[PDB]
């Protein structure tokens, strides 16, 4: 079924302003045949937030809270 969206890549990519973001849980079992050129290709690493990201997101979470 992912290969179906793969061959959709000729869905007028020049004409169509459509992209597809794959928000998997773990990139472990992702059918490595789907990471070749012409496939989904790019992958960006997101993990549990570090201490800096954690304190920043705590700040923005506390933003609406005024006590």
Partner 1 sequence: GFDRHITIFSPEGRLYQVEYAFKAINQGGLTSVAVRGKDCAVIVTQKKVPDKLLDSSTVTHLFKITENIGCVMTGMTADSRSQVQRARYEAANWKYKYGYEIPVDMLCKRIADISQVYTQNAEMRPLGCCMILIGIDEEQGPQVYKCDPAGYYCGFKATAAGVKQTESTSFLEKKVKKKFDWTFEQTVETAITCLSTVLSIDFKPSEIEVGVVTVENPKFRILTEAEIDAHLVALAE
Residues of the shown chain interacting with partner 1 in the complex, contacts defined by CB under 8 A: 32-33, 35-36
Is residue 18 a contact partner of residue 11, using CB atoms and an 8 Å limit?
yes
CA gap 41, 30 in Å, rounded: 12
Cβ of residue 37: shortest distance to partner 1, in angstroms?
10
- 54 annotated as a binding-site residue: no
Name which of 7 and 14 has its Cβ closer to partner 1: 7
Direct distance between the N- and C-terminal alpha carbons of the chain, in angstroms, rounded to an integer:
50
Name which of 36 and 43 has its Cβ closer to partner 1: 36
Q: Residues annotated as binding site for ATP?
A: 25, 36, 39, 61
């Amino acid at each position: 079924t992912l290969m179906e969206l793969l061959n959709q890549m000729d869905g007028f990519d020049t004409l169509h302003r459509v992209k597809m973001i794959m928000a998997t849980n773990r990139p472990d079992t992702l059918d490595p045949a789907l990471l070749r050129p012409g496939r989904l290709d790019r992958k960006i690493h997101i993990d549990l937030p570090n201490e800096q990201a954690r304190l920043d997101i705590l700040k923005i979470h506390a933003g609406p809270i005024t006590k």
